[PDB]
Every structure is written in structure tokens, then in C-alpha cells.
Amino acid sequence: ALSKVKLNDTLNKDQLLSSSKYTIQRSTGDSIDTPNYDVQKHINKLCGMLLITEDANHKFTGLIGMLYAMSRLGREDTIKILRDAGYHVKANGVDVTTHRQDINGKEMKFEVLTLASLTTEIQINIEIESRKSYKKMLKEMGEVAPEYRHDSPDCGMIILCIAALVITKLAAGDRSGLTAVIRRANNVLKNEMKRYKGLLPKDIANSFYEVFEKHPHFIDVFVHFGIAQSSTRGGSRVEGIFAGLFMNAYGAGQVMLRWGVLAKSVKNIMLGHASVQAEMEQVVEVYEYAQKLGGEAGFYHILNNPKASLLSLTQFPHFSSVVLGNAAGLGIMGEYRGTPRNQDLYDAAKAYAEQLKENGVINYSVLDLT
Amino acid sequence: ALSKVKLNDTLNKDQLLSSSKYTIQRSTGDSIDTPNYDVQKHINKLCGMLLITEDANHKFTGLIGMLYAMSRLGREDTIKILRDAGYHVKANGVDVTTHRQDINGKEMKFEVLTLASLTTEIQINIEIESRKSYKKMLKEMGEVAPEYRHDSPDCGMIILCIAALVITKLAAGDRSGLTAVIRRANNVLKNEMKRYKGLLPKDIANSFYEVFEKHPHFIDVFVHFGIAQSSTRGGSRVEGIFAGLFMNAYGAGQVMLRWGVLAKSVKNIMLGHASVQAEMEQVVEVYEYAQKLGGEAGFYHILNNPKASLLSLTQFPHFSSVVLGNAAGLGIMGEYRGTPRNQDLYDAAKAYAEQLKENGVINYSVLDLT
RNA sequence: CCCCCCCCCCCCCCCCCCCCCCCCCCCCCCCCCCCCCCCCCCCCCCCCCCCCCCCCCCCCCCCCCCCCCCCCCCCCCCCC
């Protein structure tokens, strides 16, 4: 029969990669700091010091942010997530030791984490510069409140909030979203910026952009931290910020998949076009594949997953054009750097999409009027 | 087919968070006091001492309130709810020891709980100041009745009654409801304020506001206590008041969800508007998601649950406007700090909603008249 | 290379208390068993017999095209 001549390449390609006999393990490096729950409270203090510091140096805040995320996970878990990702990890412990150094003649004590990635010499400078800003703050308002100080439990998550904004715009993969990351960090997190002088969206976002670029394994650590953080029963409003901002990243690097359902929902006439209908057999395979993966496919582009290319609709020129045209006519895209392969289908879809959104008459058949 | 091009993001996002391989555990601190049933009666006495004290210092009453709630749960259960919430707990026992101290020269005995969070030095001062108010009360009325004294079993729940009022207005998350908490504590719980001089709604509410802010894990303990308290077969009228005041918190931080059903019930014409109907596919998903969760979604904003953002209708500008307008026209909102994204839909919905509530004619078809 | 060790607190015990006590042999009857009839077997009958190797042709496969991605967006706020 002619019904039998078929070949499910999409399912077979997945079967090949899923049943690999051998494994590659990428060079994570010489060592990774794996802090446990006992240090979490010290890192939150370190995160607070950077936040209270006016015009703070956020060169290490991307790294310090990851240390807080790993301390929340705990040494056992964060090692487990690195090994499950596919990395040989040389686990370095993290705890508190008292360092004595004579700054400006007078001998001073400092509680420092003995980290491999972060030197004890730069850790004291974060505390030194924070004490300067603290006494300046204390001189201005007399008594500093619990909100404005570094001891607040939000401090650690406040730094991870803009980390979730950075992870939201990692799909582009060229620090192009930085403008949107800062923009949202002013619309969102506005109360937090009032109570902390050193909440600099541009400076902190670039730090997280740097640490995710330099260390691709830490983006896997943050994503699985964010999912673990979002799996909790309840916390604070700042943790509610992080959870909401983190879930905005879900479905990044695959907007054409969502806009394709929109074109189907609004019933754009150019979907029924002949050349678009020729592709419909294969576009359903990727949508069914997206339905198969489920929640797993959300961070397939944020984490540069090999199977992220399978979710692409760009391989279908005609369907992509009408979907990208529908988005243009409804006026939801811009400045989206996706170009339609078929320009005629794009313009026709844009024209009909503009006609769909016109005027606004009341539909009385929807209501249960007697 | 074009019916297959779909993607249930709401269900897949839940599937991602529900199937997390790893877990985060937040720094609960150095230690938590986990009192058992044997101390419950001592804390009730301590709660009574604060209530009989005229112009009492309710600095520790928020913490003392949590200790009574945890004593009612019992060491085994309160440890279980902290671990299920996602917290590493260092359980400190709570029981009675006799402390001898010479106040004003004369050596005096005091039954004190050896708590970590509460010092033995401040515990005796609660008893000392209560004895002053007790003898002043005894001098005025001669013989103090069972209602006015600290030994009454209601004392512990009376302090937790305004804790339920604080939890009712935690959705705002900025002590803005304090005015309403004091207001309702005067309308309801009025008989209790007559029999206790130290029932200060403003002072006690601020104490619970402080302890929930400083310790986010205790708000999880109180919510699960209130549900466990509400699951009882029956009790006193004060316990009945607490159960009623606690269930008023159910559905906090999601009033737009309830007002949306009201607009559908009253049949506001602006629901059938074109731009509102475009959102109807996605607004049903969140209502069906709210129906899926059931009783679990009640305290999703009180407990700052990551999945609380999923219940938001604010993401839909047009539907939110007509729903917020319907509430304005019926005259049920105010001073609600929610602003409509679409002003024209809000005004049109408000206008029709005002026309719905006019006059009042008798409908004789409703009755079974022969 | 570096480096004594040690250091507190503390007899134990203490009360109350014999046990036992009654009633009661057992058994007793009836009753050998068996008994008859009866060897078994007997016939007929080797089996087999023919025909027949199998195989034989034709034929590498393959060859094109193609990263992906890029937008926007915390939530909440009343009353009871």
C-alpha cells in the first residue's frame, strides 16, 4: 500500500540521541565553589553589601549571585545538577574564616568565604566600600531601617531578580536585550531600587551576562535553581518577583511557535494558502513534538540544548511568513529581528491581520441573555 | 490539520515545576522553638498576661502568638510543616523551668519557658507588668471574674484572631490594611476587647506584621495552623470567630478572579466586546487552572507562592478593564488600588453596571404563584 | 617540621512480707477364630520389493538543499 511508505525522522532522530551509548563531559575547569546551606546567610550579607554600596563595583556580582543560588540548592544538590548536566566537577567547599588585615594602619577583622573563584582580598574590599556607604547612609537618615540595610533576607534574591531578566533575554545570545533588561528592572523591582543605592540594572545584568558567557555550566545551574525555587510552597514577595520574572523566560527562543497558535486562533486567511498547506504535514510534527516534550522544551534555547533546533518553524518558509505577518498586522512584534522568507505571504497576512483588529462591535450571542 | 497547531503552556509550566529533580532550602536560621502540647497551657497563660496588662508592650506578641499556634500543632507536626514547606529546621524544645530572681530586693519565683527566640529576662517582665495590672484590676472590682482573668482558655486564640486579620490583608504586602485590621477588630471581637484591657488591635497587628515580614516561614506555619484549626469538629465561639476570620483570607490577592465571575453573573454587555472576546481563549485557561487547584489556590498570595502569578487576569488588559469597571459601577470597589489598562472599556462597563442596579421591580415569574 | 600529660562532680543503703490448711484408691459386663467354589493354556501371521542428485539468470551503494535565535511583560492592592 501507498499508506505504508513513510518515515518518522523527527521521532527517530530523538531515539538516536536518547539512546546514546557514550557520553561527553565538558571541561568545567580546575574547581567550582559548591556552597552549602550554612554559608547561604553569609552570601546574602555579601549580596546586601553590594546593594547598599553607592556606585558599587558589580564585576563579581554575577559570580556572587551564582554562589547564593548554589548555597540555596546546597552542596549535595548543586553537585548533582552539574553531574546530571554532563560536567566533571571538582567540588570546592565554602564556609567562614576570620581574616585579619591592617587597613589604614589599624588592624581589622573580616569574615570571609574561602572561595576559589573569589579572592579574600577582593571580598574585604566589598565590605570596606559598603561600610563607607553605610556610615554615609547612617549620617543622612540617623537610624537605618531594616529595609535599607544589608542584613535583609531579600538582598540575595534581589540580585537574582535581574539574573532572571538576563536569562529571559539569553535567547538572542549577544547582549542585545540588555536595554529591555534595564527597562523591566525599572518597571519591575522599583520598590527595591529605592531601598538600595547599589541596585544598578546595567552593571549587574552585564555581570550575569559575563558569567553565563564565560561559564555555560552556570546558566544550567541557574535554570535548575529557578525551577527548584519556583517549586516551593511560599516565601516572600521578592521571591514572588523572581518566580514571575523567571517564568517569563519560559518559551524564549521559540516565539514563532506561540505566534503560530495566535494566527490559528485569530483565523488568518493566508494559513489556508496552497504553499502554506503543503508544509502543514511537517509543521504539525514539530508542534506535536513541542507537546510531547512539554515543560522540558521551555528552556531549550536558554540552555543551548542540541534539540532546540528541532522546534524551529523557520525551516518552513511559507508558514513562517504568514505567522510573522499576522504578528505584524496585529502589531505585537517590533523590533523583532526575524525576516520573512516569503514577502508576498507576509504582506498578505499583515493586511488581513490589520483588518481583523478594526473598530470593535459587541457580540451579544456570547452572553447568556434571556 | 490546523486544529493540531496548539501548545498548552500553562499546563506545561506547571509540569516543569511539579517535576523538579532538585530542591532549594532557605535559611530558616540558627534555631526555631517547636513547643509541644504540654507547654500549650503555659503559652495561653502568657498570652493572657499580655491581654490583662493595661497599655501592654506587644513587641513579642507576634512571636508569642506563633508559639501558641505551634504548641497547638505539636512538636512533631510543626516540624513536619516546616520541612514540607522547604526549610532546614534546628528544632528547639519548649517546656517549663522555675527561675529565681530578686525584683525590688525580695526574691521571687517565675515559671518561664526556656525559649531561644524569647529571653527569660523579658518573660518575667510580661508577668511582672501583668501582676501590676491584675492587682489594680482586683482593687477596682474586688473579685475578678473568669472572663477578665489571664487563665481563660480563649486568651491564646484571642491574640490569634487579629493574626488572622493580619493574614487577611497580607496580599497588599505593605502594612496598608492595618487600618482595616483595626477596624474589623473593633466590629468583630468587640466582646473580647471589653474583658481585656491589653487587646490593642494596632499594637498586636503590627507585631504579627513584623514577625511575618522578618520570618516568612512563620506565615506558612500560621496558614497551615489555621487550616488545621478550621478542620476541627467544633470548639468555642472565639475559635469559631478565628475560623471565620481566617477563611476571609481565602482568595486574597486574587479579587479580580471573583469580580470576573460577578461581571459574568450580572451579564455586563462590555464582556461581549471584540477586544475582550480575543482574550477569552486565554482567560478561560486561568479560570480552569483556578478550578484545577481548588482549595490549594486560596492562600497562593498570602503564602508568596511562585504559582500565584499564573492566576493573574491583569495580563489581559481588556477583560480586566470591564471586570474592574463592573465592580466600580456596582459600587463594591474603593479604595482598591487597581488601575484599568483600557480606560474606555472601564468607563463603558461602569456606565452599564450603574444602569443594572437602578430602581428595583418585583419579578413574579420567579415565585411559584398559581 | 610540629607537639608532655593532667586539671570537674560524686560512698552506698534505708519500705513491706514464712509457707501451708478442702475433697478423693482403682476395678467390676459380654465375646476364640475358621468352615464355599475354582490351575492356567490352546487360533492365525516374517518383513521387504517402485521412481528420483542438486544447481544453472540479472544486479554495489551513493550523489541535492539547509545552524538555530532575535519582540513585549513581576504579581498584589476593596469589603466582610
Q: Which residues in chain B touch residue A283, judged by CB atoms under 8 angstroms apart?
A: 5
Query: How many domains is chain A built from?
Result: 1
A240 → chain B, closest CA residue: B306
Report the distance separating Cα A91 and Cα A35, nearest Å: 9
Q: Which residues in chain A touch residue B88, judged by CB atoms under 8 angstroms apart?
A: 37
Report the distance separating Cα A59 and Cα A150, nearest Å: 19
Q: Which residues in chain B touch residue A291, judged by CB atoms under 8 angstroms apart?
A: 6-8
Strands A91-92 and B106-113: unpaired
SS3 A103: strand
Distance B181 CA to C77 C1' (A): 15
CB contact under 8 A, B17 and A231: yes
Q: Give the structural domain span for B43.
A: 1-370
Which of B61, B72, B70 lies closest to B201 in space, CA to CA? B61
Nearest-CA distance from B190 to chain A in Å?
32
Strand C: positions under 7 A of a protein C-beta atom: 66-80
* C-beta separation of B113 from B43 below 8 A: yes
A363 → chain B, closest CA residue: B272
* C-beta separation of B198 from B55 below 8 A: yes
Which of B296, B340, B335 lies closest to B322 in space, CA to CA? B340
Distance B110 CA to C15 C1' (A): 36
Residue A294: Cβ within 10 Å count: 18
Q: Is the dihedral of CA A165, A166, A167, A173 positive or negative?
A: positive
Q: Which residues in chain B touch residue A284, judged by CB atoms under 8 angstroms apart?
A: 1, 4-5
Which of B218, B229, B243 lies closest to B62 in space, CA to CA? B218
B110 φ/ψ angles, rounded to the nearest 5 degrees: -145, 125
- Strand C–CB A9 distance below 7 A: no
Report the distance separating Cα B254 and Cα B276, nearest Å: 20
Query: H or E segment at A171?
Result: none
- For residue B231, the 8-state DSSP code is T
A182 Cβ contact list (under 8 Å, min separation 6)? A201, A202, A205
Strands B106-113 and B96-103: antiparallel
Residue at grid coordinates 514577595: A237
Distance B79 CA to C8 C1' (A): 36
Q: Which nucleotide is nearest to A191 (CA to C1')?
A: C74
Residue at grid coordinates 516551593: A232
CB pairs under 8 A between A and B: 172
Which of A230, A287, A280, A223 lies closest to A254 in space, CA to CA? A287
Report the distance separating Cα A71 and Cα B264, nearest Å: 48
* C-beta separation of A324 from B41 below 8 A: no
From residues 323-362 of B, list those within 7 angstroms of strand C by Cβ: 332-339
- Strand C–CB B282 distance below 7 A: no
Q: Which residues in chain B touch residue A44, judged by CB atoms under 8 angstroms apart?
A: 27
* C-beta separation of A52 from A196 below 8 A: yes
- Strand C–CB A331 distance below 7 A: no
Distance B1 CA to C45 C1' (A): 84
Q: Which nucleotide is nearest to B311 (CA to C1')?
A: C75
A306 φ/ψ angles, rounded to the nearest 5 degrees: -50, -35
Nearest-CA distance from A249 to chain B in Å?
11
* C-alpha cell belonging to residue A320: 513562517
A312: exposed, middle or buried (Cβ count in 10 Å: 0-12, 13-18, 19+) = middle
CB contact under 8 A, B24 and A232: yes
> Using alpha carbons only, how large is chain A's radius of gyration in Å?
25
